């Protein structure tokens, strides 16, 4: 399991990785230094001698060049020494081991690999800086941001070993993944957090920008769209030109909450042909979602057309965004005084409400809910009463937050963060827990020795009454310290338990492979499924459709 199943291997490489907005999807930022070493064995052939011959002279040290030149005799010419190393007469049917150059098949993965899609083929762009640079978009499958993670390149040596990468492994053909019959790569960060911004009704773009933008997209036919506004000024809408990124025949329909063919929320989404008609563009649409655009443009137009679709939505979005801004001050996490009141006066009633249950349960009036301890139903009475204050309070500060609020705004796009992220930050942090129980008694019948014995109120038992903006108290701190300390425990071991699960799951399915009869079997030739997936269909090409024979009145059905 160490030298056969998994060998250490040649022609490979790895660096730190970094995300290059101005790179296309299927691409791979490969530092000169690296591409200066790896080497594909190519044959002397009438079609290439003019390139190749120049490459051998171009020498093992400047870029597009080569070490080792192989002969009839199958001996080795070592270009970096050798007396005839600025000579050599490539004599047909010889190999020249060149540098790796632009537009090549490279198999780019990551540990820990858990998909077909952890690994895939990219096209090589040789670059400055010792790092591997890839398209943010391609930051999903691989899984890993730009906080320090390395990645691995494997340069194939057979012409098929090529093909088999570019035809089967190549990146865009991974876009919509079998795993879950939806795409797996979808715009993110800025891009999304601004593609929302760009698309607001209130976002109008005057001429000077509109031309760079237009020009920015590399497939633009040269035909400036007529501006939505032609009046006292000539402006377009943000939507207007984003719509230049979206191809033709693409139709997309949504409906959300208040979506009424006029959306007085700009809620929902409607995309008729290359043009967006109404709606505000964000996650649901452009995220690697099911009912969204990427899914659609792939199945519709091509993986290719869909791959090039990414970097267009990008090239514009990032640009618009550049000359707009966006951020987050701590002002993004203040809250109105008269709410800061209402939240504390929401917390007090809920602390002073646990005080009364506790009061009651101590005079033996608390009734035993069928099938649990008298105590147990009191823990349950409490947790629920404080988990509820925090939510009421958090949502009380979700209401308070204005529209310009960068946080409320990323969450509005769905770029980073949810609700809770706010609720805590600005209003209250809630109850802490270990082994699904509120804060334990280490010190006999108390939590910390800054406390009486037998105190069952929330402050005593782990209820961080303050927001993060306000600051936690010494006790609060330590309690929450006891919390998080649990999260860190799992991700240390709950990952090896997973790591083994998979090893077995993998070693147990393995050779199950749809045969030519479409019957699914194994090495013995024993049937498991007489038709894959009970319908002999690939997980990729499918999508959730409504069978509206099923719903509706017997009445409305006849109609």
């Amino acid at each position: 399991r160490g030298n056969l199943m998994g060998k250490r291997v040649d022609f490979s490489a790895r660096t730190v990785i970094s995300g290059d907005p101005n790179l296309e999807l299927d691409q791979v930022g490969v530092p000169k230094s690296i591409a200066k070493t790896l080497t594909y064995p190519e044959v002397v052939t009438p079609y290439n001698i003019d390139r190749l011959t120049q490459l051998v002279r171009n020498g093992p040290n400047e870029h597009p060049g080569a070490k080792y030149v192989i002969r009839d005799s199958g001996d080795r010419i070592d270009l970096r020494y050798s007396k005839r190393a600025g000579d050599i007469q490539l004599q047909y049917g010889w190999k020249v081991e060149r540098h790796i150059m632009d537009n090549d098949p490279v198999l780019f993965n990551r540990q820990p690999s858990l998909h077909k899609m952890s690994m895939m083929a990219h096209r090589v762009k040789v670059i400055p800086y010792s790092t591997f640079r890839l398209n943010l978009s391609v930051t999903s499958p691989y899984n890993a941001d730009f906080d320090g993670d390395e990645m691995n390149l494997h340069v194939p040596q057979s012409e098929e070993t090529r093909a088999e990468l570019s035809q089967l492994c190549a990146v865009p053909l991974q876009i919509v993944s079998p795993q879950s019959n939806k795409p797996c790569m979808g715009i993110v960060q800025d891009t999304l957090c601004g593609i929302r911004k760009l698309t607001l009704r209130d976002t109008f773009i005057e001429l000077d920008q509109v031309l760079n933008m237009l020009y920015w997209v590399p497939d633009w036919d040269g035909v400036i769209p007529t501006p939505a506004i032609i009046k006292p000024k000539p402006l377009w809408s943000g939507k207007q030109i984003l719509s230049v990124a979206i191809p033709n025949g693409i139709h997309l329909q949504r409906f959300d909450e208040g979506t009424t063919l006029l959306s007085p929320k700009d809620n929902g989404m409607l995309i008729i042909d290359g043009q967006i008609i109404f709606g505000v563009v964000e996650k649901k649409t452009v995220g690697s979602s099911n009912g969204g655009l990427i899914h659609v443009v792939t199945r519709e137009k091509g993986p290719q057309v869909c791959a090039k679709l990414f970097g267009n939505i990008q090239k514009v979005v990032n640009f618009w965004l550049l000359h707009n801004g966006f951020s987050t001050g701590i002002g993004d996490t203040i809250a109105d005084g008269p709410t800061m009141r209402e939240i504390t006066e929401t917390i007090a009633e809920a602390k002073k409400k646990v005080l009364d249950v506790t009061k009651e349960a101590q005079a033996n009036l608390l009734t035993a809910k069928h099938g649990m301890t008298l105590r147990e139903s009191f823990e349950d009475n409490v947790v629920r009463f404080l988990n509820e204050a925090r939510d009421k309070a958090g949502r009380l500060a979700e209401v308070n937050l204005k529209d310009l609020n960068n946080v409320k705004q990323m969450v509005m796009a769905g770029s980073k963060g949810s609700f809770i992220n706010i609720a805590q930050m600005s209003a209250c942090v809630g109850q802490q827990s270990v082994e699904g129980k509120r804060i334990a008694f280490g010190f006999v019948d108390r939590t910390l020795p800054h406390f009486s014995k037998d105190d069952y109120s929330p402050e005593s038992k782990g209820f961080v009454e303050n927001s993060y903006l306000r600051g936690l108290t010494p006790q609060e701190f330590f309690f929450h310290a006891m919390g998080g300390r649990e999260g860190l425990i799992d991700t240390a071991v709950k990952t090896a338990e997973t790591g083994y699960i998979q090893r077995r799951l993998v070693k147990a399915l393995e050779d199950i492979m749809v045969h030519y009869d479409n019957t699914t079997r194994n090495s013995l030739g024993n049937v498991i499924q007489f038709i894959y997936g009970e319908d002999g269909m690939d997980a990729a090409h499918i999508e959730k459709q409504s069978l509206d024979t099923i719903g509706g009145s017997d009445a409305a059905f006849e109609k």
Partner: protein, 43 residues
């Protein structure tokens, strides 16, 4: 340097937890994530 001189090992029911009684002796926070997390302690 200062951090390493003040270090605690613990060979091998709920050891890894940051337990009530730790307040004042072990740092609530300083501890090496992952590998042998929460077993090792800084005073």
């Amino acid at each position: 340097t200062l951090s390493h001189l003040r270090r605690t090992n613990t060979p091998i029911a709920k050891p890894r937890q940051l337990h009530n009684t730790h307040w004042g002796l072990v740092c609530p926070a300083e501890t090496p994530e992952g590998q042998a997390c929460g077993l090792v302690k800084n005073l």
